[PDB]
Design an enzyme around this catalytic site. Structure first.
Site, PDB file in Angstrom:
ATOM      1  N   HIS A 288       8.214   8.880  -5.011  1.00 10.68           N
ATOM      2  CA  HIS A 288       7.068   9.465  -5.578  1.00 10.68           C
ATOM      3  C   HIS A 288       6.584  10.933  -3.743  1.00 10.68           C
ATOM      4  CE1 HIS A 288       2.828  10.790  -7.161  1.00 10.68           C
ATOM      5  NE2 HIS A 288       3.040  11.026  -5.790  1.00 10.68           N
TER       6      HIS A 288
ATOM      7  N   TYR B 256       5.621   0.509  -1.044  1.00  8.21           N
ATOM      8  CA  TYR B 256       4.264   0.531  -2.043  1.00  8.21           C
ATOM      9  C   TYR B 256       4.185   0.175  -2.883  1.00  8.21           C
ATOM     10  CZ  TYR B 256      -0.126   2.572  -2.916  1.00  8.21           C
ATOM     11  OH  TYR B 256      -1.838   2.944  -3.240  1.00  8.21           O
TER      12      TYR B 256
ATOM     13  N   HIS C 268       6.927   1.403  -6.189  1.00 11.47           N
ATOM     14  CA  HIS C 268       6.944   2.463  -5.314  1.00 11.47           C
ATOM     15  C   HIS C 268       8.949   1.938  -5.080  1.00 11.47           C
ATOM     16  CE1 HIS C 268       3.885   4.931  -6.236  1.00 11.47           C
ATOM     17  NE2 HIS C 268       4.259   6.051  -6.540  1.00 11.47           N
TER      18      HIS C 268
ATOM     19  N   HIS D  38       0.634  13.542 -11.329  1.00  8.72           N
ATOM     20  CA  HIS D  38       1.344  14.236 -12.365  1.00  8.72           C
ATOM     21  C   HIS D  38       1.029  14.729 -12.959  1.00  8.72           C
ATOM     22  CE1 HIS D  38       5.184  12.355 -11.313  1.00  8.72           C
ATOM     23  NE2 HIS D  38       4.293  11.116 -10.346  1.00  8.72           N
TER      24      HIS D  38
HETATM   25 ZN   LIG Z   1       4.989   9.692  -9.094  1.00  6.56          ZN
END
Ligand SMILES: [Zn+2]
EC number: 3.4.17.14
Length: 213
Positions: A197, A189, A192, A154
């Protein structure tokens, strides 16, 4: 007439900025589990990507970037070079200068730009419905405020966090496999389950157990 204008046809053997710019536009078409190299050299992987783009918008798919191929890109291109359905601001809910990262602000925005073109391709492949972007660029402060990972792509401008929208998290993680995202994390995950993502960059790591990945 603003972002970039192609002066003439491009095919295998071509090289230059014109080639580098076209690779960005078709970076969303590298084939499943592959990534197009943005090196300014028009080789066979570039011809394949162009063919896929042509096919996706109902153009003659010969793998040659001519004027009709450029007229379609012109329809998807905004003044600032981003694709029509995504913006820099939507990709940076952190700060307004793209500073703070693990790379330059210009490298960060250029990495972001590729992500935007990959998302545009994915948006059309999924049926032209809005893709919700929840986050993108994160400076080091922003990343820590979130309790992100030290290595997080990111902070490079390579990733985007997607909300469900009308597609759902799993549908998004599954399609991402076809659009040059080497890193995909989603349902099942750790940390998440509430977003998908997707990230570009070297090294493939795909995990979304609840989605079959
Ligand atoms: Zn992310």
């Amino acid at each position: 007439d603003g972002c970039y204008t192609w002066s003439g046809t491009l095919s295998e053997g071509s090289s230059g900025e014109a080639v580098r710019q076209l690779q960005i536009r078709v970076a969303g078409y590298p084939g499943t589990g592959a990534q197009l190299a943005i090196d300014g050299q028009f080789g066979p992987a570039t011809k394949a990507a162009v063919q896929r783009f042509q096919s996706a918008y109902g153009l003659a798919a010969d793998g040659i970037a001519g004027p009709a191929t450029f007229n379609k890109i012109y329809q998807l291109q905004d003044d600032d070079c981003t694709p029509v359905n995504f913006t820099y601001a939507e990709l940076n809910r952190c700060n307004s200068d793209w500073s703070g990262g693990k790379v330059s602000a210009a490298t960060a925005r250029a990495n972001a730009l590729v992500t935007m073109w990959k998302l545009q391709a994915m948006r059309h492949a999924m049926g032209d419905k809005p893709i919700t972007v929840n986050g993108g660029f994160r400076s080091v402060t922003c990343n820590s405020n979130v309790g992100g990972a030290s290595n997080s792509r990111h902070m490079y401008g390579h990733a985007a966090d997607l909300g469900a929208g009308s597609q759902g998290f799993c549908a998004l993680a599954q399609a991402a496999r076809n659009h040059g995202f080497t890193e995909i994390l989603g349902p099942g995950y750790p940390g998440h389950n509430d977003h998908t993502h997707v990230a570009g960059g070297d090294g493939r790591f795909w995990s979304a157990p609840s989605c079959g990945i």
